Symmetry: C3
Subunit: 88 residues, 3 copies
């Protein structure tokens, strides 16, 4: 792989998170936020900027959604913790 191929995949993941927030697809936000954080922890650099954008959207979903279950809340906040520690 190249870094450019990785950031393209991370960008497409970010776009799906943007739409998943409107859709209420909480599970995919949890899964993609965890996957993006696993990638950015190995890549650093621009991968962390994309993770920062994904983290912002997940935070908003966590605050604005009235559909999120208690199980999804605890998973999403744990994934947020991984991201927040990386983007700090």
């Amino acid at each position: 792989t190249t870094e450019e191929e990785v950031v393209k995949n991370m960008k497409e993941s970010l776009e799906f998170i943007e739409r998943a927030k409107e859709e209420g697809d909480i599970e995919l936000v949890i899964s993609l936020l965890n996957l993006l954080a696993d990638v950015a922890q190995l890549v650093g650099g621009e991968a962390l900027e994309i993770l920062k954008k994904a983290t912002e959207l997940a935070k908003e979903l966590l605050e604005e959604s009235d559909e999120i279950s208690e199980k999804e809340r605890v998973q999403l906040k744990t994934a947020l913790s991984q991201a927040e520690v990386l983007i700090d």
Copy 2:
């Protein structure tokens, strides 16, 4: 700072959800939370690893407590357990 404290606070809530999950048979949730707690604990250390040790003990029991756990679920849980056990 406020980051690490919120992190370990979030991890403690997840610990409680893993316990309920282990009793409802929500093995998927146990797998997901154990992997998320390990991803966080790897970056934080300290009290995060104490919390991970406890979640590992909870997940280890569920392994062979009620044969509701499928073969696919078992291999995923064992792989997640391995991640956590190495960090411990």
Copy 3:
């Protein structure tokens, strides 16, 4: 605690389940196991990285060959592949 042989054992069984999930079209399992393998391989190196390499080749094959993979499954699988491929090069 755990031993490297116990971890390598679990990693080999995961790879067996991945290859089976590839031919059964179980996309979700491949995504979950590929990510779990990369998480473990990051901490152990050695033969863990060789098992990850095999799992990565199988997941690439699944991405190119399968037909009932959803759009959302695809973007998860590509990102998990990115994680694995970066670790293999680290």
